[PDB]
Design a protein around this ligand. Structure first.
Ligand code: HEM
Ligand SMILES: [Cl-]
Length: 152
């Protein structure tokens, strides 16, 4: 699949809004991920002992991990699909070091869209939502192809 230039514009304007508060968006996304799909928390050895949303919001380690994930996703999105070099190390680490199945990438994609809706009422309409869904689907499909090459 491919996104049109119009669709990429929609994605990057939304992302520039995320960049006004990377840490807050990353906290909200990880917390939504763990509340909607609690098994995903087991993959995060650094903070899988956290038990409540209040503990998650207070965790400096969780916030840093959210910043790192959103920083990398923003860099990838800015490549507008020409992301082969940037995606390679991420697919490698998530397949073999962190052991993240594709379904967990689907779960975090759902969490991303929900947090964008929640944080940007009136500025995340049907076109931007559809474009962001396509951008995240392309990201997952391109990771899944690298997973396949690694036999994961
Ligand atoms: C938008 C999707 C994601 C992006 C862009 C992303 C990005 C990153 C980056 C850049 C790192 C640090 C460098 C590296 O190890 O490659 C990282 C680490 C990690 N990621 Fe992801 N990630 C995503 C989704 C996920 C999901 C869904 C999970 C688990 C359910 C996950 C689990 C981890 C773990 C456990 C680490 C190591 C964290 C630590 O140091 O404590 N990632 N991720
Ligand atoms: Cl829109």
């Amino acid at each position: 699949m491919v996104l049109s230039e119009f669709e990429w514009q929609l994605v990057l304007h939304v992302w520039a809004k995320v960049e006004a508060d990377v840490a807050g968006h990353g906290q909200d996304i990880l917390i939504r991920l763990f509340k909607s799909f609690p098994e995903t928390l087991e993959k995060f050895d650094r903070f899988k002992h956290l038990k409540t949303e209040a503990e998650m919001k207070a965790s400096e380690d969780l916030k840093k991990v959210g910043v790192t994930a959103l920083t990398a996703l923003g860099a990838i999105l800015k490549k507008k699909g020409h992301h082969e070099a940037e995606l390679k190390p991420l697919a490698q680490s998530h397949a073999t070091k962190h052991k993240i199945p594709i379904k967990y990438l689907e779960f975090i994609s759902c969490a991303i869209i929900e947090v964008l809706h929640s944080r940007h009422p009136g500025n995340f309409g049907a076109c931007a939502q559809g474009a962001m869904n396509k951008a995240l689907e392309l990201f997952r499909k391109d990771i899944a192809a690298k997973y396949k090459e690694l036999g994961y």
